[PDB]
């Protein structure tokens, strides 16, 4: 079994997956809504009690077994081998999500090389009728049906969304995105096709350049006027907002998707080295660097919005209420062309925004490809090079659902359910199966023999009491209120919202299906058939 090299590459491989383009969307979009500083406090509380233990449980688990996401559960508890399949099916939906978004950013990177960024002037290709974004000396008014150049650019020059009317009527394919999407799967191919041993050198650059680019972007917006208003708008706490349950759920939700346990990717990474006496030091740095990186991430966005909000004669609130991505692709794009230093930072941000996605997209396929290959050695022994091509082409048709059907109607619908209770259901059962049925005394034993030290009686208290309660809380939060959402003055109908629920519901049907499958073929009586499936090893 191949092993990995320097300890740090590991740390660059995991943090590159830990931080992605999602953190640039949701983290700054959710904080000020939940009170800014009033959201960072529960974000830190739940990160200590909820974030780290589910994060290191998965890394410590792959450390000892070294079996992936499917074959590992033959050793933990045989009744839970369907988790790896559930990760694979859910991965197919998240693989599409992520891969199409970068095509929208790669459309900007190729276009951003031009000195005249087509983001401020509705020149001869836009819906110029509702276009006005030059805030002159009070000879203008903004109507409700009015838009800006960047709103139209993400609207009818990325999505071409006017071609289609909704989920009930879907359009064609954009030729520009059709070339952008293939280049994305090209680099995703060679990064994993060469082998996990070579992917450590791909993350060497992609996991470090964003941290440079954050500094490249932070110094610009910080030195301009208005930054004091932007930072103040973000960090000024709204304490009474913390008393609402929505703040605590969002704080617990952010740490989960920020760290990303239960997705099988962290589990696969720990399966490629013993990590003698160094795993607890590696995982703990990721959780804090991930939380500090997201803090710096949103700190750059509002720092740039502050310079605009001084120019815009308004508050940063009530600005781009539409959605996370629609905010970033439009609003932050406007600021680049409005900063005097344009033609350079258009490349820097939308080279890291792709790199944050690519690095995190490289890591995604490794979790799936590690899982299936550990089960089928007749594929890993000779077809490991061909198996990657089957997944990349499989992910290509997965991503094609968005492009040739008109625009983002599939993405936002797939957003709310592809990463919904399914990934939390997986993350829950991974915690329950490893702790309750598989004796946590044995898991604490398996880890402390590898690390030369045991973290028991602190983490354990959190693992058996705090972890199932605060993972079931996120489940119980979702069944109460249906998120009737919108996209650009178009409310989604009822049948599509149930379809997204059906896709998200069926995404984790593997774990009841597999348990039902084994209990039928297993011989014995009702009690004996259940013990054979639960019996570890």
């Amino acid at each position, epitope marked *: 079994r191949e092993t990995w090299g320097k300890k740090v590459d590991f740390l660059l491989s995991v943090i590159g997956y830990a931080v992605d383009l999602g953190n640039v969307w949701r983290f700054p979009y959710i904080c000020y809504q939940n009170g800014g500083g009033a959201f960072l406090l529960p974000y830190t509380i739940m990160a200590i009690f909820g974030g780290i233990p589910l994060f290191y449980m998965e890394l410590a688990l792959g450390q000892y077994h070294r079996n992936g996401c499917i074959s590992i559960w033959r050793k933990i508890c045989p009744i839970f081998k369907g988790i790896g399949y559930a990760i694979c099916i859910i991965a197919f939906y998240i693989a599409s999500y992520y891969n199409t978004i970068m095509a929208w950013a790669l459309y900007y990177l190729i276009s951003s090389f031009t000195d005249q960024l087509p983001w401020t002037s509705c020149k001869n290709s836009w819906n110029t009728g509702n276009c006005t974004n030059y805030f002159s000396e009070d000879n203008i008014t903004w*109507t409700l*049906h009015s838009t800006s150049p960047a709103e139209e650019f993400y609207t009818r020059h990325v999505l071409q969304i006017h071609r289609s009317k909704g989920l009930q009527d879907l359009g064609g394919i954009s030729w520009q995105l059709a070339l952008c999407i293939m280049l994305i799967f090209t680099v995703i191919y060679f990064s994993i096709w060469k082998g996990v041993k070579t992917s450590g050198k791909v993350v060497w650059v992609t996991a470090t350049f964003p941290y440079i680019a954050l500094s490249v972007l932070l110094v610009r917006g910080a030195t301009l006027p208005g930054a004091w208003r932007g930072v103040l708008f973000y960090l000024k706490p709204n304490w009474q907002k913390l008393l609402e349950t929505g703040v605590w759920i969002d704080a617990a939700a952010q740490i989960f998707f920020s760290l990303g346990p239960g997705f099988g990717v962290l589990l696969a990474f720990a399966s490629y080295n013993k990590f003698n006496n160094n795993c607890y030091q590696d995982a703990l740095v990721t959780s804090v660097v991930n939380c500090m990186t997201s803090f710096v991430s949103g700190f750059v966005i509002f720092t740039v919005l502050g310079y605009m909000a001084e120019m815009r*004669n*308004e508050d940063v*609130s009530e600005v781009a209420k539409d959605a996370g991505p629609s905010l970033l692709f439009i609003t932050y794009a406007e600021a680049i062309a409005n900063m005097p230093a344009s033609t350079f930072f258009a490349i820097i941000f939308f080279l890291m925004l792709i790199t944050l996605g690519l690095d995190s997209s490289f890591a995604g396929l490794e979790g799936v490809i590690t899982a299936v290959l550990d089960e089928f050695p007749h594929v890993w022994a000779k077809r490991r090079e061909r198996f990657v091509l089957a997944v990349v082409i499989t992910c290509f048709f997965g991503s094609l659902v968005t492009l040739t059907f008109g625009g983002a109607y599939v993405v936002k619908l797939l957003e709310e359910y592809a990463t919904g209770p399914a990934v939390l259901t997986v993350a829950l059962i991974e915690a329950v199966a490893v702790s309750w049925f598989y004796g946590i005394t044995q898991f604490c034993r398996d880890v402390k023999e590898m690390l030369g030290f045991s973290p028991g009686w602190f983490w354990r208290i959190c693992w058996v009491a705090i972890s199932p309660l605060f993972l079931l809380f996120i489940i119980a939060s979702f069944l109460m209120s249906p998120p009737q959402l919108r996209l650009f003055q178009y*409310n989604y109908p009822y049948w599509s919202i149930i379809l997204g629920y059906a896709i998200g519901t069926s995404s984790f049907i593997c774990i009841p299906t597999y348990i039902a499958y084994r209990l039928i073929i297993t011989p014995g009586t009702f009690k004996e058939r259940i013990i054979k499936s639960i019996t570890p090893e």
Partner: single-chain antibody
């Protein structure tokens, strides 16, 4: 050309629901916000809510969560505002308005109907006065930093307000050359060049920087 005509007044028992209607004309109904404003008897003006006729969305001050609900019917260019749990504190005159986007300002004003049963602004004394024709000045202070997002109004006795100064330094269309203004951040000043007897009315100092729309305490110039 633009007009906003309300219904007449009415008295409702305390605790029961009360309604006011407003028809619009002279401009596209869907190309503006239908906002509402409160006037407690003998007090300043206060924002009520907002409506988006394109999708029926609404946004309103936190004090009206269990008191009022807003809606429109674009098929007739008519607007409604439903109130519930009516009490003696709600005896007030309500205004029907037009409001475009980015000045988050009240363009025009209806006639107003009588009803019987965050960042804030402040002002100086409500008895500042001087002879006709002299240079007048009013002081307005902000509790927080607002760059230039302030306007000024004129409410004569028995009439509705009207937008006079725009962005704290420019005079709106239909406004004589007498009124000017200036200010930045937290210090805002309203001046009158050669004040006349017709300008004897109540004024207000609005906050445009952020929603909820908030006003000042209100002062009058007499003389």
């Amino acid at each position: 050309e633009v007009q906003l005509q309300q219904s007449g007044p009415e008295l409702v028992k305390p605790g029961a629901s009360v309604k006011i209607s407003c028809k619009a004309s002279g401009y596209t109904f869907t190309d503006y916000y239908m906002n509402w404003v409160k006037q407690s008897h003998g007090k300043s003006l206060e924002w009520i809510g907002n409506i988006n006729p394109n999708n029926g969305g609404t946004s309103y001050n936190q004090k009206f969560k269990g008191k009022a609900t807003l809606t429109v019917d674009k098929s007739s260019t008519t607007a409604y505002m439903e109130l519930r749990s009516l009490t003696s504190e709600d005896s007030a005159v309500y205004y029907c308005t037009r409001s475009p986007v980015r000045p988050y300002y009240f363009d025009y004003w209806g006639q107003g109907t009588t009803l019987t049963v965050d960042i804030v602004m402040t002002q100086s004394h409500k008895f500042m006065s001087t002879s006709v024709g002299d240079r007048v000045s009013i002081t307005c202070k902000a509790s927080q930093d607002v760059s230039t997002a302030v306007a000024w109004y004129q409410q004569k006795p028995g009439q509705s307000p009207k937008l006079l100064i725009y962005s704290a330094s420019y005079r709106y269309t239909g406004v004589p050359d007498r009124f000017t203004g200036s200010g930045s951040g937290t210090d805002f000043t309203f001046t009158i060049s050669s004040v006349q007897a017709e300008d004897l009315a109540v004024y207000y100092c609005q906050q445009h920087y952020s929603i909820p729309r908030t006003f000042g305490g209100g002062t009058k110039l007499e003389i």
